[PDB]
Design a protein around this nucleic acid. Sequence first.
RNA 1: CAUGAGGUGGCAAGAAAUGGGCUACAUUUUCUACCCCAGAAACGAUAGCCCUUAUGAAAUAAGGGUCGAAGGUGGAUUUAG
Lengths: 192, 132, 38, 414, 108, 20, 122, 101
Amino acid sequence: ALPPRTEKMAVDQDWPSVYPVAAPFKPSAVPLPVRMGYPVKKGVPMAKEGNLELLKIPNFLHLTPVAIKKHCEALKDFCTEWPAALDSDEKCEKHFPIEIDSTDYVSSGPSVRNPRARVVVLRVKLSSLNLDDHAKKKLIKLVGERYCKTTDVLTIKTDRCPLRRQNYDYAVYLLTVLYHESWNTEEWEKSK
Amino acid sequence: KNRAARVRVSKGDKPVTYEEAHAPHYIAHRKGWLSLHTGNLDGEDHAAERTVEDVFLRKFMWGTFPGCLADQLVLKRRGNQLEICAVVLRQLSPHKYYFLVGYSETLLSYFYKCPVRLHLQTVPSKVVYKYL
Amino acid sequence: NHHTYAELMQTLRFLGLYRDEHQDFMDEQKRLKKLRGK
Amino acid sequence: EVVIPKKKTWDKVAVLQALASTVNRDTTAVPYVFQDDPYLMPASSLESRSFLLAKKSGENVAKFIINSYPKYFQKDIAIPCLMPEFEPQIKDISEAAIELRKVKASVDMFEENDETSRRKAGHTWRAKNNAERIFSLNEHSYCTMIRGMVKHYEQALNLYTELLNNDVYTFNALIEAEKWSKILELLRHMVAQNLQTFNTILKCLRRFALQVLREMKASLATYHHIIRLFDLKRSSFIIYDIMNEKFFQSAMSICSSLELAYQVHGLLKTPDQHRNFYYSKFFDLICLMIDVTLKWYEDLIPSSQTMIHLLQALDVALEVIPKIWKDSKESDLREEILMLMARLQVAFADCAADIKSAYESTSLNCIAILFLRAQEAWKMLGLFRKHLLNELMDSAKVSSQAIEVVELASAFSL
Amino acid sequence: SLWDVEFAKQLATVNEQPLQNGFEELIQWTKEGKLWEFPINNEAGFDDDGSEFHEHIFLEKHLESFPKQGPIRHFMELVTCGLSKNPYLSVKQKVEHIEWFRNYFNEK
Amino acid sequence: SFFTKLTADELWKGALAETG
Amino acid sequence: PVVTISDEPDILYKRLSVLVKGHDKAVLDSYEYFAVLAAKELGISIKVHEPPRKIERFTLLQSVHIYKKHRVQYEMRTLYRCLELEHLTGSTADVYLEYIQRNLPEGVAMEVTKTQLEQLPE
Amino acid sequence: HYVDWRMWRDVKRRKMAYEYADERLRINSLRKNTILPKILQDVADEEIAALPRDSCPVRIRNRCVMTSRPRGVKRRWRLSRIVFRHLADHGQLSGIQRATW
RNA sequence: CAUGAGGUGGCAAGAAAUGGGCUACAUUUUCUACCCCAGAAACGAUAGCCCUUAUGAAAUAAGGGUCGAAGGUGGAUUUAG
Ligand SMILES: [Mg+2]
């Protein structure tokens, strides 16, 4: 009774302040004569005031492209600029050699724990090692299934230890000791 | 004949809502799903335990909003945020209506272990799409 | 757990905050069986 | 080289208190505690205050089941801390309260840790026996037996008199003990044996001048033991010091007894009962001193004393009377609206019949007057006689001899 | 004592102005903790006491080394590398898995 | 259990037996 | 506006990938319309492509009893989207991706991300 | 408050397979070897036999979650082939459609 | 004080016929190579026992070993496209 905000809202009034969060529909607030439903064979599609699917829409009425701009005037900060690293990544290679991944699988619902969120594969190009003229050759022969030939990239993967922050501490440790067992000369390196 | 989710034509005096007038071969063709969650996309787990909670919340609220629930609910789900939306008839006094929001909000907050927020909507009469 | 789900709904009929139609359907029907039966 | 930039640690959940600043509290709407359809929205204050209470009995009823049987709710799903519940228990069950805990004092005895813990949780005549048994079982033992006894100023200072015999609650039982030299000699005695201690030692002088010209500059709660005496942070002080020319709710009483309120307006950009006195007693100002009235009408109560000063704003300055009718309930509230149009062809005579349509559920006799200005007016004259004149003769001559049958009894019932 | 923490209670009442907008439900909801601690790292909480890639994966420090060339020790290296590839089991239950196996081959 | 339990408008239809 | 920077320089990401995974196609091309306008107001070099969908249909029996010659078959149309960002810092990404995950839609738009930080070794 | 006595025959077989799961993991880690010769591997074979019924995970028969059919079950959504089909036609699982191909 | 509940063991093999399909009865085939320019053979490959393996408290399934049956395109009749 007395349906508000829709005979009483004016234009040249700010909508991004009306729907601050994502919300459900709440048709008495929304001033559009939007319609829903597959109509009957001689009828109009359904109203706005009593629907179900305009509330079953995932509802991108929050965050209009003016709400996007007017949010980020307090969110252009938190943010410090990208270093002028002289890109195409080759001059970001001899600065920044190794490459890693650390994924999250954001689900919804009650809990957070996805056990496929500790997946760490660590990629290193071999042209960034620069201390490998024979201890290149047993790095390659130690890792059987890795080190492609068309691209000289090493991918060591760890999913043996439950936390993501220590799989990274596992990946860095097998990169450092296989490098040293490569620079370890062995007794039977000759008798081939 | 197949009788899966249709109501059957009888006369001219039987009213029916948009949803249950629609047969189940129109589920994403002409209808929406009544509950949204991240379960059935592949390969995601926690599709399984959620739907035996999803069936409670429309069997809970069929009894705690008794005689007044207009059609089925909408059970949105945003991360760790269970969003129930409901359209309900204009038959009860509003002092009762505000009671069972915060009754059911903090009893469904402390069952799912999430926050739960209710958004009611009031319609005077049951909205009828078809006089079948 | 099916006790957790089904006994909480027992007490929420007992405190009368949730009015279910199935167990209403028994205790009215069980009223009219004990008038004759049993 | 390329130098890597700064790990701008982005101040957690304040990441989205940053966004809440951008959204303004919008107009044209109810406050957000309620629901957004018109039926569940309230209309006036009595509905809205009850409704948040009606929401509140949602909580305490739902909570009660959780706390009276928690074994429905021990399925722990991750984790919020969201889950329900002769020496050792004597200090443990002193934390979960009283009378059944403190009764255990002598069956155990048949130390000073729970002699100043379990002997505090009462505040108690019979449990005052164990209060003097405190060091018969320190400083805290003998302290607030009397600071918890300025409520349960007599038997408190008498125990402050009987503690000098052999904290911040030395200065709280004795803080509000005519009496403005012992008051002097109490805060010289504070070095003998705060923003609360000084804030209690003028609460008592408030109810029972020359010490009130002195009590200040020895801060927010150090003003309500001052602002009761007269009757930015610099722009509080440039407001408050120039007021002699828990916190605010008196300052709308001074500014209503006397641009003056716009100094308070800065601290608003910095209770449910007195937070209307905030707003109702502010609207009486901005109405009196028009364009700046019409904006502030839309801003305050959309998101009986407020409509007894509402209408006379329109007196001193014309078409918004049928606008402001529908917010009366959203006789007495129905007559001062009917005062003003009796003091124009289309919009004024309609809503008086809606006051009549209000009335079917100095008042009734002023409905015929504005209506004929711009049949159904006579059936009010039928009830003026069973429950003014010079316009009834006016409307008869223009509307003729059957209306010269109307004016015949106009002098007969005089 | 009680009087220091009760002044943390009645203090909360004087500033508790209502929620008033759509954002401060989300602000309140993790100041308590029912909402998520956005951003999501999928391992929030969940520490295993500073586990760190040598307790989980080198079960040498809990072996209590026997005569190594005996057939029992080769069976313990099988069990050790099995417990190595667990992300499911923690390090307190890995040593407890050995602990039952320790009280068996002293018996047999 | 609870998950057996059902509405009324299915229950009277299964108890009245108004169609063959 | 309170941020309180410290001693410690960046973690520095490169080529953050976002796989938004949905059911309704009309949400995701309205989700990516937000995400290009959530990211090109931070000047972020961005591309979008659509991975092919995996529709995992399964079958079920129709009557409660007999009649294996009568099945009904169900399906999941579950769709995809990539939000291939490139070369952005560790502070900026985790606040850009904040505003993304805070305002991802309802049940539709499951999301998967890859994070590749670069990081000088020892 | 399980829907049959039958489910509560089977709840007992999932909790008594769970507390005795550590034991069945460690004693049956002592058989499937080539090493530790057969006398060391045959007195461990008696102890599993004297460990009871209702403990091994083979005695579970994997049942529907609310109407307790033993078969016709769908593992991903937990429920049998009828009552899952009851909800999918009112549109009550996220993204279940009729397949028309 | 049972037509309910709980425990251990057991029940599913064929004088026979019949329904549905696999394998075949082969030269458009059989074995290897290649998976489509060859070269050899001039049949059919179950079931049955035997040995390991998998999974499992505990043996059904796979693989290998041996045997190499009935089988020569099949009546009235009938099915699908
Ligand atoms: Mg059919």
